[PDB]
Amino acid sequence: KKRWYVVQAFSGFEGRVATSLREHIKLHNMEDLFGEVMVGYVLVQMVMNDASWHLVRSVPRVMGFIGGTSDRPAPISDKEVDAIMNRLQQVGDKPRPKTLFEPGEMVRVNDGPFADFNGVVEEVDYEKSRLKVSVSIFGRATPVELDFSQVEKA
Amino acid sequence: RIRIRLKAFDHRLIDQATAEIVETAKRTGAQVRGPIPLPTRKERFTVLISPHVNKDARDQYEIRTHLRLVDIVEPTEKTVDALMRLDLAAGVDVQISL
Amino acid sequence: VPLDGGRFATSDLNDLYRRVINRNNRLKRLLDLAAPDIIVRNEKRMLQEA
DNA sequence: CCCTGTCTGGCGTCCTCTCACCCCATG
DNA sequence: CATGGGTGCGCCAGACAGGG
């Protein structure tokens, strides 16, 4: 059974640290003692012998493990590892705004000169895909038409 | 296609309002079809003035109404930008239908 | 202030404050993301030393 | 607890006059 | 382009262990 550990590298050379780590594994052929390498911190599926510990710290541009102590360093305490599987890829995924297209519902504007302003949708047009919301500009409400993505639901 | 409707009562105060919004749009966007007006709107009401008698004293008052439409031609990201939270006419209802 | 050439000769306190703010932004983002214990211990320790 | 050895900190003159040189490095 | 991590001083003195 191989448990996870956290490695610190010089932040910026991290892919080169990962490649050099895979290559040191396939040099010193402790192939049964390493599972993966995930990407300033590098995640390593590993077991703990002092030989493999010296191996990972003899990989260049690696400072050391991060744990409770340096004698017996600590398996990454990611209790939500199942949630980290769903977090993988979702971290690098953006969303989209959806204006509250309903009479009297407040919305938010984040596009055009009306960006950074809130207002209410007095009228909605699903067929024309347009929301009728006015913005409190200099006091007077400024009824303007904004798309669902142009404004966010408040 | 972009409409700037302006809604008030008198033509003697909206007349400086149609001057401030075509020229400040000219310095930034310079894209406007010109002010196209609307028929003047009248709300006349005859009301009794004697306190308890005499259905003859009916004095005519009116809350007058006027509407003027600017209609910039192109959705400019400079006309709206500079004239967003900006309107010289005070006590007025601006309707920037974008 | 810059020197004769034009490159800005920056003071040392700007390096110190810029380090503390870089680390503090990283620590706020990790407490947003719910990183595990050893990551935020190293992050808060680097902020303490900064 | 009463003395003994160690471990770190705090400090060391004042004015001037030139010069030279101030972060790589790189996918 | 922008960010990211030596081995030659000597005395005083008090705090921290270390026996004693």
From Swiss-Prot, chain A:
GO biological process per UniProt: DNA-templated transcription termination; regulation of DNA-templated transcription elongation; ribosome biogenesis; transcription antitermination; transcription elongation-coupled chromatin remodeling
Residue ranges occupied by any KOW domain in the UniProt entry: 103-134
SMART domains, sorted: KOW (SM00739), NGN (SM00738)
Superkingdom of origin: Bacteria
Keywords of this entry: Ribosome biogenesis, Transcription, Transcription antitermination, Transcription regulation, Transcription termination
GO CC, any one term: cytosol
InterPro entries attached to this UniProt entry: KOW (IPR005824), NGN (IPR047050), NGN-like_dom (IPR006645), NGN_dom_sf (IPR036735), NusG-like (IPR043425), Rib_uL2_dom2 (IPR014722), Transcrpt_antiterm_NusG (IPR001062), Transcrpt_antiterm_NusG_bac_CS (IPR015869)
Xref: PROSITE patterns: NUSG
Quaternary structure and interacting proteins, as annotated: Monomer. Interacts with the transcription termination factor Rho and with RNAP. One NusG monomer forms a stable complex with a Rho hexamer. Binds directly, but weakly, to the core enzyme of RNAP. Also interacts with RpsJ (NusE). The rRNA transcription and antitermination complex (rrnTAC) consists of RNAP, NusA, NusB, NusE (rpsJ), NusG, SubB, ribosomal protein S4, DNA and precursor rRNA; S4 is more flexible than other subunits.
Domain notes: The N-terminal domain interacts with RNAP and the C-terminal domain binds either to Rho or to RpsJ (NusE). These domains are separated by a flexible linker.
Similarity section: Belongs to the NusG family.
Full protein name: Transcription termination/antitermination protein NusG
From Swiss-Prot, chain B:
Keyword annotations of the record: Ribonucleoprotein, Ribosomal protein, Ribosome biogenesis, RNA-binding, Transcription, Transcription antitermination, Transcription regulation
GO biological process: cytoplasmic translation; regulation of DNA-templated transcription elongation; ribosome biogenesis; transcription antitermination
Highest taxon of the lineage: Bacteria
Gene Ontology MF annotations: structural constituent of ribosome; transcription antitermination factor activity, RNA binding; tRNA binding
One Pfam match: Ribosomal_S10
S-S bonds: none
Gene Ontology cellular-component annotations: cytoplasm; cytosol; cytosolic small ribosomal subunit; small ribosomal subunit; transcription elongation factor complex
InterPro entries associated with the record: Ribosomal_uS10, Ribosomal_uS10_CS, Ribosomal_uS10_dom, Ribosomal_uS10_dom_sf
HAMAP family the record matches: Ribosomal_uS10
Stated role: Involved in the binding of tRNA to the ribosomes. Part of the processive rRNA transcription and antitermination complex (rrnTAC). The complex forms an RNA-chaperone ring around the RNA exit tunnel of RNA polymerase (RNAP). It supports rapid transcription and antitermination of rRNA operons, cotranscriptional rRNA folding, and annealing of distal rRNA regions to allow correct ribosome biogenesis. In complex with NusB is involved in the regulation of ribosomal RNA (rRNA) biosynthesis by transcriptional antitermination.
Quaternary structure note: Part of the 30S ribosomal subunit. Can also form a heterodimer with the transcription antitermination protein NusB. Binding of S10 to NusB is mutually exclusive with its incorporation into the ribosome. The rRNA transcription and antitermination complex (rrnTAC) consists of RNAP, NusA, NusB, NusE (this protein), NusG, SubB, ribosomal protein S4, DNA and precursor rRNA; S4 is more flexible than other subunits.
Family affiliation: Belongs to the universal ribosomal protein uS10 family.
Protein name in the entry: Small ribosomal subunit protein uS10
Swiss-Prot record, chain C:
PTM entry text: Acetylated on several lysine residues in the presence of glucose.
Protein name from the UniProt record: DNA-directed RNA polymerase subunit beta'
Subunit structure: The RNAP catalytic core consists of 2 alpha, 1 beta, 1 beta' and 1 omega subunit. When a sigma factor is associated with the core the holoenzyme is formed, which can initiate transcription. The rRNA transcription and antitermination complex (rrnTAC) consists of RNAP, NusA, NusB, NusE (rpsJ), NusG, SubB, ribosomal protein S4, DNA and precursor rRNA; S4 is more flexible than other subunits.
Organism the protein comes from: Escherichia coli (strain K12)
Family from the record: Belongs to the RNA polymerase beta' chain family.
Reported biotechnological use: Co-administration of salinamide and rifampicin or salinamide and myxopyronin suppresses the emergence of resistance to both antibiotics.
Domain of life: Bacteria
Coiled-coil annotated spans: none
Positions spanned in the full protein: 253 to 302 of 1407
General function of this protein: DNA-dependent RNA polymerase (RNAP) catalyzes the transcription of DNA into RNA using the four ribonucleoside triphosphates as substrates. Resistance to the antibiotics salinamide A, salinamide B, rifampicin, streptolydigin, CBR703, myxopyronin, and lipiarmycin can result from mutations in this protein.
